[PDB]
Each structure stands twice: as C-alpha cells, then as structure tokens.
Amino acid sequence: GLEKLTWVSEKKPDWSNVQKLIAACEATNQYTNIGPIISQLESFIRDSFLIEESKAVIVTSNGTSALHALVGGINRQLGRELKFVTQSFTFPSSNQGPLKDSIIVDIDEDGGLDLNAVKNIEYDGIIVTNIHGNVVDINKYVDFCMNHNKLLIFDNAATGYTFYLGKNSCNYGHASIISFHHTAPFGFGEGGCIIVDRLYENNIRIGLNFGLDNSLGEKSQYSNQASNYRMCDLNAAFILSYLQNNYKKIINRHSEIYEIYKNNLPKRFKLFPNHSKKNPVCSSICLLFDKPFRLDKIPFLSRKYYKPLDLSSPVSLDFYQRILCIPCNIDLTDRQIYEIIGVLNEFADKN
Amino acid sequence: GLEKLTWVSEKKPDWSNVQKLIAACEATNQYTNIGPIISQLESFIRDSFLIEESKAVIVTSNGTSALHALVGGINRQLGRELKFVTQSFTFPSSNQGPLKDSIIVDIDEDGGLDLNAVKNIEYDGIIVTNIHGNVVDINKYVDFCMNHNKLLIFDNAATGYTFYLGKNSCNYGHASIISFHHTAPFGFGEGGCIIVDRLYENNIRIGLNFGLDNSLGEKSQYSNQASNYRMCDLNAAFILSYLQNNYKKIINRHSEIYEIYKNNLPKRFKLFPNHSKKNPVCSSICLLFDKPFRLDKIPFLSRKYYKPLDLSSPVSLDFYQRILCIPCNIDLTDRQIYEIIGVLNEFADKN
Numbered sequence: 268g269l270e271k272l273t274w275v276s277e278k279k280p281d282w283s284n285v286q287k288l289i290a291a292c293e294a295t296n297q298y299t300n301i302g303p304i305i306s307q308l309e310s311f312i313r314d315s316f317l318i319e320e321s322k323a324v325i326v327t328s329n330g331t332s333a334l335h336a337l338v339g340g341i342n343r344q345l346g347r348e349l350k351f352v353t354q355s356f357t358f359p360s361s362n363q364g365p366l367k368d369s370i371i372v373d374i375d376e377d378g379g380l381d382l383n384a385v386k387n388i389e390y391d392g393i394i395v396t397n398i399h400g401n402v403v404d405i406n407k408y409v410d411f412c413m414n415h416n417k418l419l420i421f422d423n424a425a426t427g428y429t430f431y432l433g434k435n436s437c438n439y440g441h442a443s444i445i446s447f448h449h450t451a452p453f454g455f456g457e458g459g460c461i462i463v464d465r466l467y468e469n470n471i472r473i474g475l476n477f478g479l480d481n482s483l484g485e486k487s488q489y490s491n492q493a494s495n496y497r498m499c500d501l502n503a504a505f506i507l508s509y510l511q512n513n514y515k516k517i518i519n520r521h522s523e524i525y526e527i528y529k530n531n532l533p534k535r536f537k538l539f540p541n542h543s544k545k546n547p548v549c550s551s552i553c554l555l556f557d558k559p560f561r562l563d564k565i566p567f568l569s570r571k572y573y574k575p576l577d578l579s580s581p582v583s584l585d586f587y588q589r590i591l592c593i594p595c596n597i598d599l600t601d602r603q604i605y606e607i608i609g610v611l612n613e614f615a616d617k618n
Numbered sequence: 619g620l621e622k623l624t625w626v627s628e629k630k631p632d633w634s635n636v637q638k639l640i641a642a643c644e645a646t647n648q649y650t651n652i653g654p655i656i657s658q659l660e661s662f663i664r665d666s667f668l669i670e671e672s673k674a675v676i677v678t679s680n681g682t683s684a685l686h687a688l689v690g691g692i693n694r695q696l697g698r699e700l701k702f703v704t705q706s707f708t709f710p711s712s713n714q715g716p717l718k719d720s721i722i723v724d725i726d727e728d729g730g731l732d733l734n735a736v737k738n739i740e741y742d743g744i745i746v747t748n749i750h751g752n753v754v755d756i757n758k759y760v761d762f763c764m765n766h767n768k769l770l771i772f773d774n775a776a777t778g779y780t781f782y783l784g785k786n787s788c789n790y791g792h793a794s795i796i797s798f799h800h801t802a803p804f805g806f807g808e809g810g811c812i813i814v815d816r817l818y819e820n821n822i823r824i825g826l827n828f829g830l831d832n833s834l835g836e837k838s839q840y841s842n843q844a845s846n847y848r849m850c851d852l853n854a855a856f857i858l859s860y861l862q863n864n865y866k867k868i869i870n871r872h873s874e875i876y877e878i879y880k881n882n883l884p885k886r887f888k889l890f891p892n893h894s895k896k897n898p899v900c901s902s903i904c905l906l907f908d909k910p911f912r913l914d915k916i917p918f919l920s921r922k923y924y925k926p927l928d929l930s931s932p933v934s935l936d937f938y939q940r941i942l943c944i945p946c947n948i949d950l951t952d953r954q955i956y957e958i959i960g961v962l963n964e965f966a967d968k969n
C-alpha cells in the first residue's frame with residue numbers, strides 16, 4: 268500500500284494548453300527577455316493566490332533567483348550590499364549569492380528566526396522561513412521590523428497559499444518569494460516568484476536583465492548587484508498550464524490531508540508549529556516526535572528538513588533530529604494516510 | 619528587402635521531437651535536479667561541438683550561471699573567493715555574482731583583455747571574451763597564464779564553434795562558457811554550458827545544487843559559493859531538439875555568410891579582429907568603421923556590442939564607437955547580404 272508513496276504528485280504537461288501558450292512565442296520569436304507569457308503568469312499568480320495591488324508579482328528562473336533578485340534589486344536601490352540575518356533552520360538559498368555573507372541565527376520553538384538572538388547584531392533586514400506551508404506568528408515579525416526599521420523578507424518557497432488574518436502570507440513584510448520547483452505543490456520544472464512592495468519593483472525587474480533598462484536608451488546601465496535572474500517564457504507556459512489545471516485541487520486536497528493528521532495524530536508526535544486559523548497548504552506534513560530519531564526507523568518514504576545551515580544552532584538541530592516530513596500531494600489516498608498514521612503509532616510504542 | 623531582417627532566425631519547437639524527449643521526464647516525474655535529458659544534451663554538445671575528454675561538459679540555467687557556477691565551483695575547491703580580471707569590452711556577466719568585484723581592464727586592438735594591464739596587479743585569473751564568434755590570439759593568453767600561474771576562462775557565450783589550431787576554442791584555458799540564450803545561434807529560450815578541466819568538475823556540478831552531494835548522505839554540505847545554477851530538463855529538451863535539427867546548417871551557413879562579407883568588404887570597414895584559420899561561426903557580423911558613428915545613421919537592423927563595463931577604457935570605447943554588428947542567421951538571403959554591403963558602401967561615401 269505505502270510502497271507506492273511519492274514526494275510529489277505525478278505531473279505531466281497539458282501539451283495542448285502548453286503549445287497554445289507558446290504559440291504566442293512562435294508568432295513573434297520571443298521566448299525570453301520578457302516574452303508574451305511572463306505577464307500571463309504574473310497576472311494568474313496575482314488573481315489566483317490573491318496578491319494585493321501594493322505588491323509587484325515578478326517571476327524568476329527559480330525560488331533561489333527570486334530571493335537573490337529581490338536582494339540585488341533592494342541593494343541597488345539603497346546603494347550598498349545590505350546585511351541580512353537568516354535562520355539556521357532553512358534551505359541554503361538565504362546564505363548564497365548576494366546573501367553569501369548573511370548572518371545565521373537560531374529559530375525559536377515556533378519555527379521562525381529567533382528575534383531575541385539579533386539583540387546585539389548590525390543588520391539591515393531579516394529573512395524568516397515559513398516552513399513547508401506552515402507560517403510563523405507573521406505580525407510578531409512585522410511589528411519587530413517596523414519598531415527597529417528593518418527590512419522583512421518571508422522565504423515562502425514552500426508556502427504559496429497559507430492565509431494569515433484573511434490574506435495570503437506572501438502579502439506580509441516588504442516582500443516574499445515562492446518556488447515553482449517541481450518538488451513544490453504549485454511547481455513544474457524550475458521557477459520562482461517575488462511578491463514585493465512597488466517601491467522596489469523597477470530595480471528588481473531591471474535586475475533580472477543585468478540591471479539594464481531598455482527604456483533608458485543610452486542611459487541603460489548594468490549593476491554589479493544584478494544577474495540573469497529572469498524566467499524563460501517556455502518555463503512560464505509549463506508553470507501557468509500546471510496552475511490553471513491544478514492550483515484549486517492542490518489547495519483543497521492539501522487542506523483535507525492536513526485535517527486528517529490534525530484529528531488523528533500518532534502518539535508522541537506534534538504538528539510542526541503553525542499560526543494560520545485555517546489549515547495551511549503544505550509541501551509536506553511535518554511532525555515533531557518527542558525525542559531524536561533516525562529516518563531509517565521509518566519504513567515508508569519520509570524526509571528531514573532542514574539540515575541546519577549552522578550546525579551550532581541548538582533549536583534548529585533539535586527540530587532536525589525530531590522532525591518527520593511525510594509526503595503531501597494530490598495522488599495520496601486517505602487509506603494511505605491512515606496506513607501511515609498506524610505505522611507511526613507502532614514506531615512510537617517501540618521508540 | 620532589408621525590412622524583413624531579424625537578429626535571430628525564426629525558431630520553432632519540433633514539438634513531436636520535444637514531446638518524445640520529455641516522455642522520459644513524464645515516465646519518472648523527474649524534470650529537474652538532473653533528470654534524464656541533462657546527460658543527453660551534455661553528450662550531444664560533447665560529440666557535436668568536439669569537446670576533448672579532459673573537459674567536463676556541464677549545462678546550466680543560462681550563460682551567466684555557467685560563468686558564475688564555474689567561478690563558484692573553483693572558489694569552493696580552492697577554499698577562497700578568487701579575484702578575476704575581465705575586459706571592459708564584454709557583457710555584464712563577468713562583473714556579477716561571484717565576479718561582482720572583478721577588476722575591469724581594457725582590451726588591446728586584437729579584441730581581448732590587454733595582458734599589459736595585469737603585469738603589476740594582484741589577481742588569480744583572467745576572463746577573456748571571444749567577441750561574437752571571433753577568437754583572440756588564444757595561445758598568447760594560454761602562454762601568459764601558464765607563465766604567471768593564473769587561471770584562464772574564455773567567455774565563449776557567443777562562440778560555440780570557432781576552431782583554433784585544429785580544436786574548438788572552448789577546449790582552451792582551464793574552462794570556457796557558451797550561451798544557449800534565444801539570441802545565440804545555437805540557443806533556444808535560456809541556457810548555458812561550462813567546458814572545464816576535470817579537476818573542477820565535481821565541485822562545479824554539486825555547486826549547481828547549492829553545493830549539495832546526495833551521494834554523501836548526511837556529510838552533504840552546502841557552500842555559500844553555490845546556488846541554484848542547474849539547467850531544467852524541459853529547457854534541455856528544447857535546446858537539444860533545436861541543436862539536433864539545426865547545428866550543422868548553422869555552422870555551414872554562418873561560415874558562408876562570413877565568406878561573402880570577407881570577399882565583398884564595404885568601404886572603410888574592417889572585419890572584427892579574428893585569429894581562426896577557417897571562417898568563424900558568428901552571432902553577428904561585426905565590422906569596424908574607420909571612425910566613430912551613430913547607429914541611427916544605419917538604415918537597417920544593426921546593433922553595437924559591447925557598451926564598455928568601464929566607460930574610461932579607451933580601446934573598448936573606440937571599438938564601441940566604430941563597431942557595427944549586422945544580423946547573422948540562417949534566415950538571411952545572399953540578396954540581403956549584398957544589399958546590406960551596398961548600403962554600407964553608400965554610408966561610407968556620405969560619412
């Protein structure tokens with residue numbers, strides 16, 4: 268039964284839909300450098316994920332490039348290489364590229380960057396990871412960055428449709444990023460998106476194109492803070508088509524999977540910390556066992572995220588050692604979920 | 619007849635062929651993190667472009683990420699952020715990402731980084747741009763870097779199939795990069811490739827995946843010098859298909875178009891400096907006028923590359939003021955070439 272578990276739902280192109288979209292590229296020979304699909308996908312993300320008009324929606328090559336293009340654009344606007352703090356319990360993206368020298372501090376027990384740990388640090392902003400669709404106490408972080416006059420970026424790579432006080436979590440802070448990597452619920456191949464205050468929109472958009480702005484003609488000027496961060500229209504067509512066919516079913520079905528775990532917790536596990544009133548839409552079901560344990564004890568497909576970036580982050584290491592990330596996708600039957608919960612109950616009695 | 623000039627030939631997916639290649643992805647749900655297409659495109663590039671076995675062929679998301687992945691891999695291998703010199707007369711890529719603090723020096727009149735400008739300064743390596751399919755005197759750079767114990771990278775973004783003393787220019791220096799951007803002769807959408815000494819292959823390839831090596835399980839370690847730099851298998855399929863169908867015709871027709879300009883040079887125009895014995899395979903036909911002039915004087919689709927990264931570099935600036943980059947692609951007719959040449963004679967008579 269559980270032998271057939273996969274991390275990601277089986278994802279195949281709607282070839283007729285993808286070919287219809289790319290027929291726009293074929294007619295003009297424009298397949299990149301902001302061809303005719305980019306605005307269709309940015310529009311679809313705004314209207315489907317419910318991004319406020321105060322935010323630009325900016326697609327990039329991947330979730331990593333979304334975060335990097337966001338920072339390089341803000342670096343260009345403020346005129347220096349900004350110093351960000353990130354949490355140890357997250358993916359490498361937030362200590363790479365323009366963040367390669369980001370400061371790493373521990374999480375608190377709610378899964379986000381420990382605000383008590385930056386007391387005595389020099390920094391311009393913080394990056395907080397909303398883990399696998401779960402969200403932190405977002406207003407704790409908004410209030411803190413308002414009071415201390417800091418930039419706030421939410422790493423929502425795995426968190427495209429978790430609502431906080433009646434609005435997509437992507438709408439909070441100065442910006443968020445989401446991943447359309449194949450392993451993400453909304454993903455297909457590679458891609459990313461920046462949700463950012465309009466203040467920074469132009470510098471981030473031209474920052475996808477080496478900092479060059481064709482609208483300036485001979486005044487067009489590259490920035491050493493920019494790169495090739497743009498989304499290819501080919502990738503936009505595959506992502507847009509996947510979202511068109513699947514995004515509603517993913518939200519409802521992922522919410523249904525979360526409901527079953529919430530009402531049938533195996534003994535001595537807890538749900539990863541989450542601060543949304545409705546079920547989050549998760550990239551995996553993350554449970555914390557009450558004691559450290561090794562994945563090879565679990566006789567079904569399962570993972571640990573995230574290996575701490577700084578292995579001297581004690582709260583981050585504890586979570587890593589105690590966490591069990593279970594597949595969450597639209598291919599999973601309830602029968603499989605109940606068979607999973609029974610294997611975990613067994614494990615809990617013998618460990 | 620010059621109304622219908624395009625920079626790039628009309629490029630259209632061979633959909634039955636692309637569908638056939640991506641069927642391997644559909645069968646396993648693996649569309650990135652090195653799916654079943656990556657090895658196929660890497661092999662084709664090795665066998666078709668005639669790369670030697672002492673070189674890795676490593677595809678990436680774009681030409682920029684090929685350069686940045688190359689530098690990040692080497693930085694991580696040597697345990698230090700290496701200092702590169704780049705030429706002013708190049709694209710912004712070689713002053714971005716891990717090269718954002720690269721030293722910019724002038725070209726000499728042969729079109730490459732002026733070695734006299736790095737006699738008395740600190741640096742680990744040089745990046746030399748082979749402009750639009752033209753190649754520098756490659757052995758003077760190989761000899762200099764061997765004598766001074768310096769790394770040598772060729773920015774071959776626009777230069778996939780120009781031969782130097784019997785082998786693809788990509789096989790010289792410690793590494794080269796090529797672009798599969800839609801604007802490149804070999805390109806389709808977005809893509810890049812690294813041709814590099816085997817010594818650096820493993821650090822560069824894991825460096826496309828945040829520095830992570832799955833084969834090491836728990837000792838898998840991210841690097842602050844890495845990123846998401848991989849090519850998605852979707853992109854690999856479009857590029858591999860375009861190359862299967864067109865690469866031979868592009869090589870022959872681009873060489874024939876060059877032959878016509880070389881035997882019918884317009885008045886007071888010289889070919890861009892080139893050191894290949896056979897006609898180079900050009901991304902555009904670059905001519906130097908005998909004095910500065912404006913593009914708005916040329917009554918057909920034409921460009922100037924490259925706006926100097928450092929506007930104070932005198933040879934780079936002189937080149938930019940005198941250069942005319944004429945479309946070179948497999949849609950161009952001989953009729954159109956002789957018309958362009960007639961227009962440039964008329965331009966010379968009046969300027």
Ligand SMILES: Cc1ncc(COP(=O)(O)O)c(/C=N/[C@H]2[C@H](O)[C@@H](O)[C@@H](OP(=O)(O)OP(=O)(O)OC[C@H]3O[C@@H](n4cc(C)c(=O)[nH]c4=O)C[C@@H]3O)O[C@@H]2C)c1O
Nearest residue numbers: 274329330331358360424446448449647648649650651846
């Ligand atoms: C908080 C955060 N911020 C930023 C980012 C950066 O976003 P991107 O630049 O990646 O868009 C991430 C990435 N988060 C993602 C990564 O994107 C992904 O590589 C995977 O990191 P790995 O676990 O190292 O990948 P891999 O082991 O290859 O795949 C996991 C499972 O998915 C399966 N899979 C994978 C791919 C690529 C596929 O095409 N099909 C498929 O079935 C295989 C396996 O069972 O998951 C992370 C959580 C992130 O979690």
Ligand SMILES: Cc1ncc(COP(=O)(O)O)c(/C=N/[C@H]2[C@H](O)[C@@H](O)[C@@H](OP(=O)(O)OP(=O)(O)OC[C@H]3O[C@@H](n4cc(C)c(=O)[nH]c4=O)C[C@@H]3O)O[C@@H]2C)c1O
Nearest residue numbers: 296297298299300495625680681682709711775797799800
């Ligand atoms: C020396 C060197 N190193 C590194 C790189 C970096 O490689 P990538 O990361 O780009 O793969 C480049 C790129 N060199 C290329 C760039 O790839 C391209 O953006 C274009 O830089 P722009 O001139 O700023 O782009 P754009 O004006 O949009 O395109 C030029 C012409 O191509 C036409 N076009 C363009 C696209 C994107 C398309 O899809 N279809 C099409 O017909 C329109 C126009 O007439 O040309 C450069 C020489 C380079 O020349």
Ligand SMILES: [Cl-]
Nearest residue numbers: 431432543544
């Ligand atoms: Cl809420």
Ligand SMILES: [Cl-]
Nearest residue numbers: 281508509512
């Ligand atoms: Cl679909």
Ligand SMILES: [Cl-]
Nearest residue numbers: 632859860863
């Ligand atoms: Cl084709």
Ligand SMILES: [Cl-]
Nearest residue numbers: 782783894895
């Ligand atoms: Cl030769």
Ligand code: NA
Nearest residue numbers: 309323324325
């Ligand atoms: Na927008």
Ligand code: NA
Nearest residue numbers: 321438440464
């Ligand atoms: Na706001």
